[PDB]
Coordinates of C-alpha atoms and ligand atoms in Angstrom, one line a residue:
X1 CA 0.0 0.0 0.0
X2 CA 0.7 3.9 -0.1
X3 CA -0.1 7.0 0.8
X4 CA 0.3 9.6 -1.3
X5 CA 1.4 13.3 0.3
X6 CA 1.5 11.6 3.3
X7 CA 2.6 13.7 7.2
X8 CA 6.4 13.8 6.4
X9 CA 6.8 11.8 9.8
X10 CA 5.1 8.5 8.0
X11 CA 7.0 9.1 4.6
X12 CA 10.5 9.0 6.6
X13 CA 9.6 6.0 8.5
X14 CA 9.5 3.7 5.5
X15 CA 12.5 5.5 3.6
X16 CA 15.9 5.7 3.6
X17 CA 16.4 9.0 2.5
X18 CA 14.8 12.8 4.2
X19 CA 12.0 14.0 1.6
X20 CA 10.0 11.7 0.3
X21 CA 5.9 12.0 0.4
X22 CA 4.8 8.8 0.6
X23 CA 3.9 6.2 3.2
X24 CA 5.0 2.9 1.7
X25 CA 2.9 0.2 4.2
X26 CA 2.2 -3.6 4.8
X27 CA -1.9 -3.6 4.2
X28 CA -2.3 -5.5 7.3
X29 CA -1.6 -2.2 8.9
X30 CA -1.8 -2.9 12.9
X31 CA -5.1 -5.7 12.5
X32 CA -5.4 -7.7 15.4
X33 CA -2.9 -6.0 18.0
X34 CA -3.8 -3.2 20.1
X35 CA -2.3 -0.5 21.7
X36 CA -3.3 1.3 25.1
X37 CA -2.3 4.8 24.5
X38 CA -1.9 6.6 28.3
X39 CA -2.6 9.9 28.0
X40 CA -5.2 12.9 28.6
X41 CA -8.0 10.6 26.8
X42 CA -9.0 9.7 23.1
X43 CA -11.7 11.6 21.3
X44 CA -13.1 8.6 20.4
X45 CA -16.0 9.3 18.5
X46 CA -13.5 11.8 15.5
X47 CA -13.9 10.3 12.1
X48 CA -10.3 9.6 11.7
X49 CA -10.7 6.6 13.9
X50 CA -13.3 5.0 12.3
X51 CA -15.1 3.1 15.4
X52 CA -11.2 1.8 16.4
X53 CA -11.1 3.5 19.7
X54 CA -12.2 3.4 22.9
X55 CA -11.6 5.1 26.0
X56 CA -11.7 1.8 28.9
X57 CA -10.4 3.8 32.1
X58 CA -10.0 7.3 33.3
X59 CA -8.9 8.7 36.9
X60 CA -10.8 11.5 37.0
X61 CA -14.4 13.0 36.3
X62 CA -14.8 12.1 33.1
X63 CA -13.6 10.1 30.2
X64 CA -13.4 12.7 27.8
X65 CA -10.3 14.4 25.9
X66 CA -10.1 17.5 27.0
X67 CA -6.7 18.4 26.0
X68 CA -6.1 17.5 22.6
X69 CA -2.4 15.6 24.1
X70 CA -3.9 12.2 23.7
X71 CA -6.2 12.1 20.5
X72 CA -2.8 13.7 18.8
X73 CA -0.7 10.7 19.8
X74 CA -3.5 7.8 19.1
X75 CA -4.2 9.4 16.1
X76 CA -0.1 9.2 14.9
X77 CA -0.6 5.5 16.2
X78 CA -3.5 4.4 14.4
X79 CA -6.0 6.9 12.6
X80 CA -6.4 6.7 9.1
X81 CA -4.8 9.4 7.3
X82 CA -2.3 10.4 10.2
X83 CA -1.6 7.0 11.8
X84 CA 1.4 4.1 11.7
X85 CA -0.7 1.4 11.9
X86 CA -4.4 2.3 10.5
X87 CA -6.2 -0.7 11.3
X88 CA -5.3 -1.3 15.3
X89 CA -7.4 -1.3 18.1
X90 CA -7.3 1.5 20.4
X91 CA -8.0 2.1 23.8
X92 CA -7.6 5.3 26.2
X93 CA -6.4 5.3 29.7
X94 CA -6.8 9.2 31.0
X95 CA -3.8 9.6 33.8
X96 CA -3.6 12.8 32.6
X97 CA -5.9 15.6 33.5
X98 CA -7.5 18.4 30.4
X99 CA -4.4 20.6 31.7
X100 CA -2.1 17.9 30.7
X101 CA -0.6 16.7 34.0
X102 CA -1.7 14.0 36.5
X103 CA 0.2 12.5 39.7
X104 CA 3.0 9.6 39.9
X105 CA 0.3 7.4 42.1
X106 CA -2.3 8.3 39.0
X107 CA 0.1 6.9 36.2
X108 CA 1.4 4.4 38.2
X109 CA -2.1 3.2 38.6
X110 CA -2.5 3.5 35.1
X111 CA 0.2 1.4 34.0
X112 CA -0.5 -1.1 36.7
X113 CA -4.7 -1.2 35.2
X114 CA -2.8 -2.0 31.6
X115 CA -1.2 -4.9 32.7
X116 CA -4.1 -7.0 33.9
X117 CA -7.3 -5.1 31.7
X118 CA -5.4 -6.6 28.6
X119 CA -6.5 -10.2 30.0
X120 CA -9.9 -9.1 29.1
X121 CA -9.1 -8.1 25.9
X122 CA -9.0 -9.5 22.4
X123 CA -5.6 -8.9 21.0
X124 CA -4.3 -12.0 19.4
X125 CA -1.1 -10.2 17.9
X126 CA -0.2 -8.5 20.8
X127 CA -0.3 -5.5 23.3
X128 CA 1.3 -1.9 23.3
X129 CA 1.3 0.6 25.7
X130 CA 2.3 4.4 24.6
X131 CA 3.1 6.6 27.3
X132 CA 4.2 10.1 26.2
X133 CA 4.7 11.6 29.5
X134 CA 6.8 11.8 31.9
X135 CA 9.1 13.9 34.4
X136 CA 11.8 14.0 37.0
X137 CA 13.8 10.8 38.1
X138 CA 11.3 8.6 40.1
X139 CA 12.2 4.1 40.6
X140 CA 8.8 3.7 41.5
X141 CA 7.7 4.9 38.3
X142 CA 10.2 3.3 36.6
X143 CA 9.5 0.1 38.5
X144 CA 6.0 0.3 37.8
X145 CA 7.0 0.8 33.3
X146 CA 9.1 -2.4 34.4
X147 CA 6.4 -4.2 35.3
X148 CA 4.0 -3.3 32.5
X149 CA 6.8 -4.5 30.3
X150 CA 7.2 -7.7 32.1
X151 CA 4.0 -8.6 32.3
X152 CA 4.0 -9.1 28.0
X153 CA 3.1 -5.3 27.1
X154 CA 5.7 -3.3 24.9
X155 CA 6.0 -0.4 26.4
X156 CA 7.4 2.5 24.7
X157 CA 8.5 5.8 26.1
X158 CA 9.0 9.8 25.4
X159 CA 12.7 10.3 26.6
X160 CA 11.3 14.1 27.3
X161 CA 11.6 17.7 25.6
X162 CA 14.6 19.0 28.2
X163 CA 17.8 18.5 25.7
X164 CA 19.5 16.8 28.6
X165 CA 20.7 13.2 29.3
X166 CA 16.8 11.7 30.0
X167 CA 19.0 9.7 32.5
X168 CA 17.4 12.1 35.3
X169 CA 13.8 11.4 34.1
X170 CA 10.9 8.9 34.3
X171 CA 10.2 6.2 33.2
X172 CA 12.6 7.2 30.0
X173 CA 15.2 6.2 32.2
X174 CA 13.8 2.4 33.1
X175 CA 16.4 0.5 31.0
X176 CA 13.9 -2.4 30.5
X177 CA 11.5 -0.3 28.1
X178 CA 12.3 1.4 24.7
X179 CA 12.6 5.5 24.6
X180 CA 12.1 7.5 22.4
X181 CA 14.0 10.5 21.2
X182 CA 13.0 13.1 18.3
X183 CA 14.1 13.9 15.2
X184 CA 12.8 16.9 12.1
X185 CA 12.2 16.6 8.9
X186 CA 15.8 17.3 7.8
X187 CA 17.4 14.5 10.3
X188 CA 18.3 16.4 12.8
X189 CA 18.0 15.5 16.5
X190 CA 15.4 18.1 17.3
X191 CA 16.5 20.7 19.5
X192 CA 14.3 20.2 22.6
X193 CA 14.8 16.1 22.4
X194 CA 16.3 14.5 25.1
X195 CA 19.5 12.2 24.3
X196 CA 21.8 9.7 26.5
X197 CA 22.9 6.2 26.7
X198 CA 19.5 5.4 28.0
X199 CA 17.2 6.2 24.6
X200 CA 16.9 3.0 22.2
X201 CA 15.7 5.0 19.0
X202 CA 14.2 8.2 17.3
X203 CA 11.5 8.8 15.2
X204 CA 9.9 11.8 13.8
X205 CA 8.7 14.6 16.4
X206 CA 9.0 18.0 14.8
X207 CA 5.7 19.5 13.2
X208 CA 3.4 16.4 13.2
X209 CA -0.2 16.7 12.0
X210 CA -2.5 14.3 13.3
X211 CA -5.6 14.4 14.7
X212 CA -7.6 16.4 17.3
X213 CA -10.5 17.3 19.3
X214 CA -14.0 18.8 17.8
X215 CA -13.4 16.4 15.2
X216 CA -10.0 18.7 13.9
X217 CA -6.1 18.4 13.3
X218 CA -3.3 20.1 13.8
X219 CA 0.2 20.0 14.0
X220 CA 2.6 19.9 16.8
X221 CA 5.9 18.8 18.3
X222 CA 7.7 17.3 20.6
X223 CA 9.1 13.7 21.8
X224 CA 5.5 12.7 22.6
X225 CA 4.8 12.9 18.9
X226 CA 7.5 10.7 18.4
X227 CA 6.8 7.9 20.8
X228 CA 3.8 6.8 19.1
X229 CA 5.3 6.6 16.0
X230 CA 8.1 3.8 17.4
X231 CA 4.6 2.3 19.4
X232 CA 2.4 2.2 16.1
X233 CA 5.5 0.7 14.6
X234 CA 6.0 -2.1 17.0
X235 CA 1.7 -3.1 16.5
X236 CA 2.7 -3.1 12.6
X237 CA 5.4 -5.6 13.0
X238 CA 3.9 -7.7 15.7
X239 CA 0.8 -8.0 13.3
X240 CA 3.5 -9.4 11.0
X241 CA 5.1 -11.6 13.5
X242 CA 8.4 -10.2 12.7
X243 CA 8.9 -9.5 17.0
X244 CA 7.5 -10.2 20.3
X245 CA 6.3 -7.6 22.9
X246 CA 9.6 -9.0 25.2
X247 CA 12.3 -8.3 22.1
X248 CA 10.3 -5.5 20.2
X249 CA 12.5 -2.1 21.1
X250 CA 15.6 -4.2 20.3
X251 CA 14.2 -5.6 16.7
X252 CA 13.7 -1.6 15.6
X253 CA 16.8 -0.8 16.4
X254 CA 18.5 -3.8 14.9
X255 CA 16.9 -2.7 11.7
X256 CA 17.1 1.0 11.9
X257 CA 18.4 3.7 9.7
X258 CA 21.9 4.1 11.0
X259 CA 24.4 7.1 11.4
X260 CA 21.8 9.4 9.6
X261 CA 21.2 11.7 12.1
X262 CA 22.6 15.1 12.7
X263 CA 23.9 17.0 15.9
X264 CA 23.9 13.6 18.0
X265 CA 25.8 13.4 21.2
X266 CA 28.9 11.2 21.7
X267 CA 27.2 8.0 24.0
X268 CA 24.3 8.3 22.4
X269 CA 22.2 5.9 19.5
X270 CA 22.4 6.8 15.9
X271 CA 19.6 4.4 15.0
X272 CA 16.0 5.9 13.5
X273 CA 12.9 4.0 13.3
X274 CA 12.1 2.5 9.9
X275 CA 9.5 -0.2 8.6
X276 CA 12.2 -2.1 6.3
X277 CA 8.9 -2.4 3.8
X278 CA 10.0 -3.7 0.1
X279 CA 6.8 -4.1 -2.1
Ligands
CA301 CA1 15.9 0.6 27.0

């Protein structure tokens, strides 16, 4: 399949080369896994995700995406025009609040609900948590992304928009799960994106459109937009059998693009996320 004047983010993803338009994809696109995207909520009812998602579990008030922060990342996972893998199933988990922020005990909470809700769940090709979020250094919280990756979940990461070693934050810094740095449209490490020997990978972060509340899009940036990218990736090639939930982080980066990216810090992965697709 492709997609023609495709988001630059998708086109880069299956390419080996900056500034190409179009999203060459594997049809199966994402069927039969699904990915728990833990976040301010999915607007699930917006066209782009044509009956795929499903908010199963908020901490607050109401279930409802207030914020915009997670219908922008499910929609770069999985919504039609915008997404990695088009035909997964979604589900929201709202740790985060309309104002975009949400305690430690919430998300650990959240993370923990994951683990066992996805026993009630059909998702033959697997599971895939998304969790662009995070802060300062916590072990419990990076315990608790330990955990949620041990239990059979890949769980993939935003090393955070600070441009410092994501060593001092959480859970980017929980060895055991894959993190995500950024990168722009030119291969560059994007300015704001966290780097270190902790991060696994980068994918595209820097003006992403995708989708929105009230039904809209919009572009944005940031290593949030990036992390769903590498988790919409991981639901495309579990759908394909090509890795496991336990060995997924490690398969992207044994089959990334390597040494293409710009301004990267000594200690730190040249690697950036790419589908490997030949027609
Ligand atoms: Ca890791």
């Amino acid at each position: 399949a492709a997609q023609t004047n495709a988001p630059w983010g998708l086109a880069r993803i299956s390419s080996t080369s900056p500034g190409t338009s179009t999203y060459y994809y594997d049809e199966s696109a994402g069927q039969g896994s699904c990915v728990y995207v833990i976040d301010t909520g999915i607007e699930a009812s917006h066209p782009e995700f044509e009956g795929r998602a499903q908010m199963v579990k908020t901490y607050y008030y109401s279930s409802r995406d207030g914020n915009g922060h997670g219908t922008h990342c499910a929609g770069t996972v999985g919504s039609r025009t915008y997404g990695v893998a088009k035909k997964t199933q979604l589900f929201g988990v709202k740790v985060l609040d309309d104002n975009g922020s949400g305690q430690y005990s919430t998300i650990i909470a959240g993370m923990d609900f994951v683990a066992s809700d996805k026993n009630n769940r059909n998702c033959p090709k697997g599971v895939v948590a998304s969790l662009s979020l995070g802060g300062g250094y916590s072990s419990s919280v990076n315990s608790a992304a330990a955990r949620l990756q041990s239990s059979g979940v890949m769980v993939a990461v935003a090393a955070g928009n600070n441009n410092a070693d994501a060593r001092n934050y959480s859970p980017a810094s929980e060895p055991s799960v894959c993190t995500v740095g950024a990168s722009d449209r030119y291969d560059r490490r994007s300015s704001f994106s966290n780097y270190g020997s902790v991060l696994d990978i980068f994918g595209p972060g820097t003006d992403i459109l995708s989708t929105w509340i009230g039904g809209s899009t919009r572009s944005i940036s940031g290593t949030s937009m990036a992390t769903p990218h590498v988790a919409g990736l991981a639901a495309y090639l579990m759908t394909l059998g090509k890795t496991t939930a336990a060995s997924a982080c490690r398969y992207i980066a044994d089959t990334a693009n390597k040494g293409d990216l710009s301004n990267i810090p000594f200690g730190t992965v040249n690697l950036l996320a790419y589908n490997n697709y030949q027609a």
